[PDB]
Structure 1
Amino acid sequence: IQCSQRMLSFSDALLSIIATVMILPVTHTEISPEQQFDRSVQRLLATRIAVYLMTFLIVTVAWAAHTRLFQVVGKTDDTLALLNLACMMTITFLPYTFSLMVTFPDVPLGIFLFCVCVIAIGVVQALIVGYAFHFPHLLSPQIQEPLSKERVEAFSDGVYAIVATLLILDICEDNVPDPKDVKERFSGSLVAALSATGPRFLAYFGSFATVGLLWFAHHSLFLHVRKATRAMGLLNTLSLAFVGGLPLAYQQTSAFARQPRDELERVRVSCTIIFLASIFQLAMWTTALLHQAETLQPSVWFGGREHVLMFAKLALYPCASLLAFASTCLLSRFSVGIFHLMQIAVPCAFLLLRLLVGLALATLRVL
């Protein structure tokens, strides 16, 4: 008999890596053709984004089945650990097979391989169940629809870390000046070649800050969560899926455009992605409030000490993205500066959120 905490943490890490595998083809796409190949580039980008979303959802369904399986199976052992490794190996093949099926939709080999992967996952899970039931001491006591907050938290943390580090990974792999280009194309100067790679650094900074503040909000929320439901899990899955597109949005924003219309368009798209990623966390919080007694600590109840602070922490990014979108639409001349100042300010708001909340409550007070 062994504790299964670390095995499930390892599984969560693997599954988080496998769910974000199809976002690299998205962030590795052509920024812009620059010869007006505009039609076929956005097409491929949209197809890649659809494939990413579908693969994320499928791997999340697999992860949820795994969580239920090892909620009915309490303690693990050597054989169960090896079978779980086999299950992880099976799951690792879902993105490749799905991409193959949606790339070659006419030949039956792709759907065949997809269904084979699925059936193999199911067979490994059934073997785990059979082993656990042949040895009753490996079953949870109640055996001998709330999700496990542990697994949700670990999975979300992994997704957030990957999405926050994508751009720095790509930088460190590719954007390191080579001496030849330095003292040939830049007239013997390393500082020049490094400044040439400034846009990517600013994109990484923005993406890391945004993803880290969204993780901060998620962490503050789930510190007060008692029982995670399936609806909250769905909303968290949607939030995480839309969190993966922040690196692409920041890449497009920081990149210089041809004419300001594309500037406004890219700012709009980035604000939309942020708004979705954040409004789904806000929806998680409201769905939990629907049943606060069996879902939330009394601190964040209707009338609790930390209720308004949590509302603000979770509604900060959505309101900012909405205001930036309204800027893009109406003003339409100071939109980029508004977006950049919000990039810089939202963090300072998170840092001074308690002071601002008190000031605003006093404002409501004596008026």
Structure 2
Amino acid sequence: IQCSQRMLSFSDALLSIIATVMILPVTHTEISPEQQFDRSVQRLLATRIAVYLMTFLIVTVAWAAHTRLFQVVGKTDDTLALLNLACMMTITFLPYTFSLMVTFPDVPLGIFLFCVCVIAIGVVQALIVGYAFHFPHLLSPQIQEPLSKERVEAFSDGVYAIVATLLILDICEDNVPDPKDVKERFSGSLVAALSATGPRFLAYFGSFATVGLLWFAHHSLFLHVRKATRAMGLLNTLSLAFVGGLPLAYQQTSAFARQPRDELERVRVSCTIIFLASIFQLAMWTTALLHQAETLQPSVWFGGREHVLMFAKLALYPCASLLAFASTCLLSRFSVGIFHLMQIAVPCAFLLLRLLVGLALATLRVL
């Protein structure tokens, strides 16, 4: 009989990979230069987005069920590890089957495959439960609503890492100049061929910075969380789902724009995605504040030392996104520059957040 922590961490990593499988088609969608094709291209992209959102949810539900199952099976053994591997393997087919079901609505085989995968997941989990109850010493002591904060943190960390490294993975695969290309299409200059790839690196820069800072806020919040809840888990799931869309937004804000309005609308979309990703972290914090006695450490309670700093940390990005979005409507001519200035400023504000909070508190105290 063994401790289950490493096995559950491995399962969380696998589930995080599977939950994000359908983002690659979205980011690998090519921004066509011909605007006349837009109507078609958009129709594809939106669909690819919708599927991504559904899959991430469905897998999340499975993950949640897993998190509950092994709250009832505390200690693991060899048989349970092998069975959990089987369960992970079954879960890995959910995205493909759902994608096939949506791609072939009128073919009854797609729904059959998806339902059979769901049934197989259920069967393996029931086998795990039966095995653990046949050997009672593998059950949790209380067996012989809250979600395990451990699993939430691990799953979120995996999702954040994948989303932060998506664009660098794509660059490392696709954008190493061909030695022959550097000759004819760049007159032998590796400098020029690399410079012709600047926009993609700027996109990776922006995406990694934003995802890392959102992870930083999430990490700061869950460092103070005594107990996670189902509502908090749902809000975290929504936040991660919208975090997945940040690399796309940053790709679109570095591409070439024939018309300024395209730049403006891409900025709008980017700010909207950032706001959606961050407002649900803030909602997580606010919902936890409803039951701070049970969910939060005293430090972040109302009147605590770290309450205001935590609120500022979790409300920074939403406020910045809202300000940029409002500028796009009221200060259009400067909106793109404001967006870039925000991309530079927000990391600096996170760096100097404590001093800024103290300064604001003192200023309001004297005022």
> Normalising by structure 2, what TM-score?
1.00
CA deviation digits over 1:289-324, x for unaligned, max 9? Answer: 000000000000000000000000000000000000
Give the Cα separation in 2 of the matches to 1:288 and 1:136: 35
RMSD between aligned alpha carbons?
A: 0.5
Give the Cα separation in 2 of the matches to 1:334 and 1:19: 38
Instruction: State the shift of 1:332 in Å.
Output: 0.7
CA deviation digits over 1:73-128, x for unaligned, max 9? Answer: 00000000000000000000000000000010001000000000000000000000
Give the Cα separation in 2 of the matches to 1:254 and 1:290: 41
CA deviation digits over 1:7-51, x for unaligned, max 9? Answer: 000000000000000000000001134252110001100000000
Give the Cα separation in 2 of the matches to 1:34 and 1:296: 53
Equivalent position SS for 1:179: coil
CA deviation digits over 1:164-212, x for unaligned, max 9? Answer: 0000000000000011000111001000000000000000000000000
Give the Cα separation in 1 of the matches to 2:334 and 2:15: 42
Equivalent position SS for 1:364: helix
Give the Cα separation in 2 of the matches to 1:334 and 1:7: 51
Instruction: State the shift of 1:220 in Å.
Output: 0.1
Give the Cα separation in 2 of the matches to 1:111 and 1:213: 40
The 1:57–1:33 alpha-carbon spacing in structure 2 relative to 1, beyond 3 Å, is: same
Give the Cα separation in 1 of the matches to 2:218 and 2:180: 46
Partner of 2:338: 338
Give the Cα separation in 1 of the matches to 2:66 and 2:149: 14
CA deviation digits over 1:199-255, x for unaligned, max 9? Answer: 000000000000000000000000000000000000000000000000000000011
Give the Cα separation in 1 of the matches to 2:21 and 2:57: 12
Equivalent position SS for 1:176: coil
Give the Cα separation in 2 of the matches to 1:103 and 1:38: 21
CA deviation digits over 1:262-304, x for unaligned, max 9? Answer: 0000000000000000000000000000000000000000000
**Any residues of structure 2 matched to 1:1-367 within 5 Å, and which?**
1-367=1-367
> Normalising by structure 1, what TM-score?
1.00
Give the Cα separation in 2 of the matches to 1:7 and 1:261: 50
Instruction: State the shift of 1:331 in Å.
Output: 1.1
Give the Cα separation in 2 of the matches to 1:44 and 1:185: 32
Equivalent position SS for 1:333: helix
CA deviation digits over 1:140-183, x for unaligned, max 9? Answer: 00000100000000000000000000000000000000110001
Give the Cα separation in 1 of the matches to 2:44 and 2:346: 33
Give the Cα separation in 1 of the matches to 2:12 and 2:64: 10
Give the Cα separation in 2 of the matches to 1:67 and 1:273: 28
Give the Cα separation in 1 of the matches to 2:76 and 2:333: 61
Give the Cα separation in 2 of the matches to 1:320 and 1:114: 41
Give the Cα separation in 2 of the matches to 1:20 and 1:145: 26
Give the Cα separation in 1 of the matches to 2:104 and 2:363: 61
Equivalent position SS for 2:84: helix
Give the Cα separation in 2 of the matches to 1:340 and 1:33: 24
Instruction: State the shift of 1:258 in Å.
Output: 1.2
**Structure 1: 5+ residue stretches without partners:** none
Give the Cα separation in 1 of the matches to 2:48 and 2:258: 24
The 1:268–1:35 alpha-carbon spacing in structure 2 relative to 1, beyond 3 Å, is: closer
Give the Cα separation in 2 of the matches to 1:224 and 1:333: 42
Give the Cα separation in 2 of the matches to 1:337 and 1:270: 14
Give the Cα separation in 2 of the matches to 1:82 and 1:354: 48
**Structure 2: 5+ residue stretches without partners:** none
Equivalent position SS for 1:95: helix
The 1:323–1:81 alpha-carbon spacing in structure 2 relative to 1, beyond 3 Å, is: same
Instruction: State the shift of 1:256 in Å.
Output: 1.6
CA deviation digits over 1:333-354, x for unaligned, max 9? Answer: 0000000000000000000000
